[PDB]
Amino acid sequence: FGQLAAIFLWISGMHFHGAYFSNYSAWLSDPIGIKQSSQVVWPIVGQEILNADVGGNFQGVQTTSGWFQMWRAEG
Amino acid sequence: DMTWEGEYPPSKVLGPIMSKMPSGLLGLISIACAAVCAYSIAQSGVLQQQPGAYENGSWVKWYYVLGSFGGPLAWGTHVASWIQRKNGM
Amino acid sequence: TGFEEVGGKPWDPLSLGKLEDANDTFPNMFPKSQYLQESEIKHGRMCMLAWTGVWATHVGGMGLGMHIPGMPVESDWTKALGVFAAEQPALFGAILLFISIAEGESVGHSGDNWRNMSTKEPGNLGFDWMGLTKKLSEEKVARYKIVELKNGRAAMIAMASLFAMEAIPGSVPIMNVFN
Amino acid sequence: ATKFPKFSQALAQDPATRRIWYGIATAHDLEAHDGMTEENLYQKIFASHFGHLAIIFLWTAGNLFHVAWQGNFEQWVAKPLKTKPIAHSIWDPHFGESALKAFSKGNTYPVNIAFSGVYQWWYTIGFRTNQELYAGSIGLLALSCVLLFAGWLHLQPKFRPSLSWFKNNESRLNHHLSGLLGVSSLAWTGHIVHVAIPASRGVHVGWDNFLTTPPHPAGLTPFFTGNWTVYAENPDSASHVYGTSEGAGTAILTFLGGFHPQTQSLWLSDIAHHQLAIAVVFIIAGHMYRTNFGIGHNMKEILDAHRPPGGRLGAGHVGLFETITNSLHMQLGLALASLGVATSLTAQHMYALTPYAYLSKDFTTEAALYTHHQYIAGFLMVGAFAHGAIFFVRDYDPELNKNNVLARMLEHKEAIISHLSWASLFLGFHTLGLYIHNDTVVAFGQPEKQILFEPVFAEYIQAASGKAVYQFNVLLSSPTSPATVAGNQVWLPGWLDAINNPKNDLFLKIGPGDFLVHHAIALGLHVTALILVKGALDARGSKLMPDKKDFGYSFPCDGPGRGGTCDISAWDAFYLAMFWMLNTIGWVTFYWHWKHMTIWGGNPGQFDESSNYIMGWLRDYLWLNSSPLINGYNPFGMNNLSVWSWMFLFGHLIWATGFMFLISWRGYWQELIETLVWAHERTPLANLIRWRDKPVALSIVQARLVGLAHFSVGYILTYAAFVIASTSGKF
Amino acid sequence: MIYDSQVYIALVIAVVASVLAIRLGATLYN
Amino acid sequence: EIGGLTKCSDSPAFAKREKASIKKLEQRKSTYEAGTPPALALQQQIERTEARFDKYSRSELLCGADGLPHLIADGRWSHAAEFMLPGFGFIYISGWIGWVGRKYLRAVSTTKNPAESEIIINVPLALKIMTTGYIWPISAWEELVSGDLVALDEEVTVSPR
Amino acid sequence: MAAAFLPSILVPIVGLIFPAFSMALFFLYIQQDDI
Amino acid sequence: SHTVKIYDTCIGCTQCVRACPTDVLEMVPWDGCKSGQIASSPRVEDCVGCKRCETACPTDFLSVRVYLGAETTRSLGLAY
Numbered sequence A: 001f002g003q004l005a006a007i008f009l010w011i012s013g014m015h016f017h018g019a020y021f022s023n024y025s026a027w028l029s030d031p032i033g034i035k036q037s038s039q040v041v042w043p044i045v046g047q048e049i050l051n052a053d054v055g056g057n058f059q060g061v062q063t064t065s066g067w068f069q070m071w072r073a074e075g
Numbered sequence B: 001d002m003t004w005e006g007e008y009p010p011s012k013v014l015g016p017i018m019s020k021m022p023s024g025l026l027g028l029i030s031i032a033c034a035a036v037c038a039y040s041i042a043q044s045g046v047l048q049q050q051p052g053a054y055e056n057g058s059w060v061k062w063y064y065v066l067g068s069f070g071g072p073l074a075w076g077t078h079v080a081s082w083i084q085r086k087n088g089m
Numbered sequence C: 001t002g003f004e005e006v007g008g009k010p011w012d013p014l015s016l017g018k019l020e021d022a023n024d025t026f027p028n029m030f031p032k033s034q035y036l037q038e039s040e041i042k043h044g045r046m047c048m049l050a051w052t053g054v055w056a057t058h059v060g061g062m063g064l065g066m067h068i069p070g071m072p073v074e075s076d077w078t079k080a081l082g083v084f085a086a087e088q089p090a091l092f093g094a095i096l097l098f099i100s101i102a103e104g105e106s107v108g109h110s111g112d113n114w115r116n117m118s119t120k121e122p123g124n125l126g127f128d129w130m131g132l133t134k135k136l137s138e139e140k141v142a143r144y145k146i147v148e149l150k151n152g153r154a155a156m157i158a159m160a161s162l163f164a165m166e167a168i169p170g171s172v173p174i175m176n177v178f179n
Numbered sequence D: 001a002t003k004f005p006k007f008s009q010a011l012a013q014d015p016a017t018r019r020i021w022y023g024i025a026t027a028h029d030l031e032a033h034d035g036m037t038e039e040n041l042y043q044k045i046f047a048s049h050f051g052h053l054a055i056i057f058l059w060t061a062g063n064l065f066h067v068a069w070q071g072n073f074e075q076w077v078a079k080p081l082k083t084k085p086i087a088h089s090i091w092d093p094h095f096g097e098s099a100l101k102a103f104s105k106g107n108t109y110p111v112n113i114a115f116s117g118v119y120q121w122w123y124t125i126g127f128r129t130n131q132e133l134y135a136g137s138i139g140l141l142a143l144s145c146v147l148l149f150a151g152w153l154h155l156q157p158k159f160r161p162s163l164s165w166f167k168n169n170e171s172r173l174n175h176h177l178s179g180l181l182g183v184s185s186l187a188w189t190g191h192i193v194h195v196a197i198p199a200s201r202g203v204h205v206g207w208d209n210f211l212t213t214p215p216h217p218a219g220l221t222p223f224f225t226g227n228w229t230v231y232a233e234n235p236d237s238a239s240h241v242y243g244t245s246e247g248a249g250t251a252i253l254t255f256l257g258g259f260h261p262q263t264q265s266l267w268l269s270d271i272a273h274h275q276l277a278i279a280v281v282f283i284i285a286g287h288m289y290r291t292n293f294g295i296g297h298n299m300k301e302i303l304d305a306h307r308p309p310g311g312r313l314g315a316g317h318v319g320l321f322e323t324i325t326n327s328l329h330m331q332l333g334l335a336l337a338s339l340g341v342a343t344s345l346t347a348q349h350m351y352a353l354t355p356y357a358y359l360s361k362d363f364t365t366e367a368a369l370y371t372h373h374q375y376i377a378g379f380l381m382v383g384a385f386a387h388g389a390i391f392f393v394r395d396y397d398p399e400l401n402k403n404n405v406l407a408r409m410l411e412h413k414e415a416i417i418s419h420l421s422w423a424s425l426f427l428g429f430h431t432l433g434l435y436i437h438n439d440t441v442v443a444f445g446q447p448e449k450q451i452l453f454e455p456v457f458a459e460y461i462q463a464a465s466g467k468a469v470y471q472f473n474v475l476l477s478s479p480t481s482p483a484t485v486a487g488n489q490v491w492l493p494g495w496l497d498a499i500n501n502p503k504n505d506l507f508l509k510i511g512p513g514d515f516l517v518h519h520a521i522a523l524g525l526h527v528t529a530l531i532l533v534k535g536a537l538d539a540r541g542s543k544l545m546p547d548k549k550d551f552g553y554s555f556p557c558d559g560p561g562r563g564g565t566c567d568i569s570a571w572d573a574f575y576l577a578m579f580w581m582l583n584t585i586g587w588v589t590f591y592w593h594w595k596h597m598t599i600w601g602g603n604p605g606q607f608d609e610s611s612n613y614i615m616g617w618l619r620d621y622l623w624l625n626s627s628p629l630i631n632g633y634n635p636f637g638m639n640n641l642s643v644w645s646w647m648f649l650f651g652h653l654i655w656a657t658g659f660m661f662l663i664s665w666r667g668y669w670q671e672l673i674e675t676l677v678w679a680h681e682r683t684p685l686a687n688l689i690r691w692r693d694k695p696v697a698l699s700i701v702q703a704r705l706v707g708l709a710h711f712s713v714g715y716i717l718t719y720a721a722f723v724i725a726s727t728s729g730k731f
Numbered sequence E: 001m002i003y004d005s006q007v008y009i010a011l012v013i014a015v016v017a018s019v020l021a022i023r024l025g026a027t028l029y030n
Numbered sequence F: 001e002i003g004g005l006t007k008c009s010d011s012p013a014f015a016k017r018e019k020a021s022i023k024k025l026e027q028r029k030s031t032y033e034a035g036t037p038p039a040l041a042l043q044q045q046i047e048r049t050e051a052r053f054d055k056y057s058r059s060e061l062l063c064g065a066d067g068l069p070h071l072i073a074d075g076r077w078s079h080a081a082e083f084m085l086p087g088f089g090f091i092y093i094s095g096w097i098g099w100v101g102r103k104y105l106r107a108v109s110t111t112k113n114p115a116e117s118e119i120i121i122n123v124p125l126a127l128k129i130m131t132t133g134y135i136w137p138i139s140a141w142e143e144l145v146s147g148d149l150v151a152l153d154e155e156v157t158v159s160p161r
Numbered sequence G: 001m002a003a004a005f006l007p008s009i010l011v012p013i014v015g016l017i018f019p020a021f022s023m024a025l026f027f028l029y030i031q032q033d034d035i
Numbered sequence H: 001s002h003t004v005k006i007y008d009t010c011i012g013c014t015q016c017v018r019a020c021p022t023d024v025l026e027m028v029p030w031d032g033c034k035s036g037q038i039a040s041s042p043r044v045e046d047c048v049g050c051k052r053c054e055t056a057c058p059t060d061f062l063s064v065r066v067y068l069g070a071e072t073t074r075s076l077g078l079a080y
Ligand code: CLA
Pocket: C078, C079, C081, C082, C083, C085, C086, C089, C090, C092, C093, C094, C096, C097
């Protein structure tokens, strides 16, 4: 049950970062030109260069877990 | 044999010749070797810069090379002078 | 005693005269008391001459201007040795050779005062030459050793005062009332 | 003992395959053999020293034979800047037709192109023809016949030297300083005055005419009259065409300094005056020690008397004479330690002060020669500390060495090891920390946030020798200094021209990339020392094993008890320091090659920017210069770099095979062999055949050694394939 | 230019050096 | 201009790096319109890049031919802010951490089970000991003289020699 | 090359025949129950 | 065979004998310790060299020491 609690916390984080820190709404309108990104980096010691120009008026880390394609499949 | 204790070595570490020499004689020899070496270095310096006396190594004189090796002889004879003085000659 | 300015007991706040026997790690890497006393007397005797040499060759006010006719002329004491060693080379060497022979003779007869193995009392270079340990009593020559020690410490502070003015030009404000 | 190994009864009765393995690897540990006396031990070492000397001269006769027969030395002395030197020819039946023409590009038959530099060295010492190289290979072939007879002769019962002859330290040093060092340097001065310097002056002096052709026009009367300045009268000009008489001088002993302007190499008259002055110093140095004639020093008396009266070194050097004279391992460890310094100094001075004509223009040879001698110097330094560790187990007597300088190292061995541990950790924390800092800020697009320490201490040393680019104005870069005035009359115009020429290797321009890699080299030196010093000082015992000297130098472990004792032997600290040696020589030769491949490539500023962070080493040195190598063969064909690309992958495979013996340990493999022994005993028609030695897994120490030898061979072969094919492929 | 006979002379001196090496090797083995 | 270097305020290769790094950020900002959070983030990066390059210009840093600042650490006080002034700050802090770690160890060394007070830290004792580290150079000299710093050789375990 | 036939003779001797000979002799020598 | 030595610091705890998998060690009567017994290794021909006896020994730097030496079929633990 503790492992299931850690997986449910991890799933709940991936949907919260999709809801708040992603370009999923822009990606739904153009899934070919817009890169999937669901992680944003804070502007500290120079690491804000990691926020890629992913399109959809958004800057973040390109994420490759396939969350946007799973969410679109669910409707 | 040549092991020693205390503050000073015995006289026999100077070899069979300087172990019998007085400390004042070895002290004055040391100043004589130091002055010959300092004269030989200074005169080889002025022979290097003299414009007719340095070409093809003409600044090298045999008596100034042999005189300059009084430097390590001045070191050793003043060390030997100290050892004879500590040993009461 | 010579402890009247610092109470009535020996003064050593950093305890630098206890470093050799404090621990066992650095064997005979620190000097013992005979070397420390002899270096205190020698630094004081050199500073008593050196402060007098700056005072007797200063050409401004309050410092009496002595000069030897024939010597090089540079009243700046921070450069006077360079102009003396260049223009009078045989005299500069004869002074240094005398200093050299006296410095080596001062420990060449005695032992290792760094390890408290010396046979003579520190400060005694065999240069009495006029009396006075034979003439004066035993407590008078003990009084005069405290005098030379304290005048040596006072001139050491004075030579540190002259070293500080040339490095940091606001170190000693008392040396501004003399000009 | 019957049933090989003959010298070890214990291994002779081993029933397994361990007997043959351990009989090979203990064959030269002559002190451990059964029935070995001390007098027989020295006589076997003396005779096998004659065999090793013959092998060196046979190897040198083979290099001379194959160049004279199959090489292009006579075409190389005609056009030294256009000809590729041939090592030997190739006869390989596995070659295809396109490989035969790929290796016979400028020639008739397939060849290997020599990167040892023997062409540039033989040309400098006067060789001009193939017949002269052949006669040299015959004389070395007969010299090694004599050395093989002398090893046989000095084992015959009337010619076996006594043990006192082997212990005569005073007569050996007197002869080896005079005869071996000083007389040979005087004789080499005789060669280059009579043979090599006329050959650079366009004059042939060989055996046919050297008795009737004086090497100087004044001809040996200024030597005996003391008018020695005649031998430095007219040197070669600044416009002397090398090997010809045009512009050529007649002086045989100069102090010119710097380089010959055409060959970019040392003046032969400077080398002759160097060798002659080295000869006199060593001949004099061989008059120190007391042989049969009463004068001279006794070496036991010098060591017994050198105790400082302050007592900071306790008893001094008493006992050290009998310690060294009775320990061949301490003698060997001292000899390997100086040879390792002499081989590092050889590498560091041959690239920077080029001794051979046109050697600095052969870029692959210069890279091969530096990498060769620095890896040789790493192996010698590890062996010096290894035999220093064997000495403490096998030869150190704690009662003869009582309170002397040797025993007091064991007395404060924890202070030595924990301070080497501090300096190793300080270097590694900050050198790796500064590299990772410079990696991180350059990756984030901010290279101006890099921590770039300027190496001003070493730049001060260059400026003290006269380098003017750092504008320090100190000793030889200051024309007012007495070092500059006294010196300008002698070598310094040649030296200041050479040191301030930015197109040679004399004191290369250094910057912050050179700072961080020297502190990586200092890290690698300190850790490799730390393993080796802890290997020697803990060789006799630790808290984990207080009786370790009873078990010897090499043993597997002391078992899983007391926490576990894997790799506790002093042999195992040799084994761990070999990885740190190869890493250290790795960091050295990587730095030499990349700094030279950017200087030779014309972009020295690429090293100055990219060496500050690790990605510059990976991208701009490893990945970039791999490109000619890995295209030695491809799906579209091959070229003569195909042997180095094969060796590159061959080196990667042996390195990785070493990891198997390094990671997998014995009890896995012994259980796997037991099922293989079962399968053979139960298989018909293979049941006809049986082993006579029982198959076992390799022992614990053996696969440590086997895994280290695979690791080291794959290390060497990969970099030799890369340092050669990248320089040959680019240039 | 090395001739054919010069290669054959070197092979004869080499095969004598092989005999002397076996003699040194057998004496060291004893 | 110590080792043949130049000051970064007077070297063009440092000025060329400032021009090129701002121009790379301005090209990315041109692909966004004005009020967007990508354009507001890239405007802050331009001001931080500009403030960094102007800070390095006016602050004694020597630049090489590459246009990057090099630090001089031979001991001279004209470049004290590059190594020696951060070096005094490190030695004071690291000497503090070492002194109070040593002080806490010897404090709990006399308790009943000293190992449990190292996996379970006595926090009020540790917090009290930690604030005493600000005068660690005074107390390290006092412990050196009094003998509490250095153990005697007869009290320290060693191996066979 | 002068005697160009000599690599065709000596390389199969040094590469094939001499290692076949020397590995066979060492194998025979290590299995001898006497010296 | 391997060499197994008993030093006189043995307290006769018998733990090395109980740990030995090939029966090298046995307890013999002694008087140098209060247990009245010392370990002994008569059958060192069967010692495989496992050093289980060294792990079992409680005395500070063990009274049993195994010195690995000449390997036999029994010393190598070969079942073939
Ligand atoms: C009569 C013949 C004769 C001649 C021609 C010389 C000539 C010389 N002697 Mg010699 N000497 C002689 C007799 C002679 N001497 C005798 C009879 C003795 C006693 C036996 C000596 C013993 C002697 C000694 C011990 C030394 C000399 C030295 C010298 C050289 C002095 C050069 C110099 O001063 O630069 C000095 C440099 C300068 C003046 C430039 C510096 C100026 C700057 C601006 C100063 C800046 C401040 C500075 C940084 C502070 C430094 C302080 C620090 C020194 C404490 C000169 C060649 C010296 C020498 O050079 O030996 C190698 C030396 O040390 N002589």
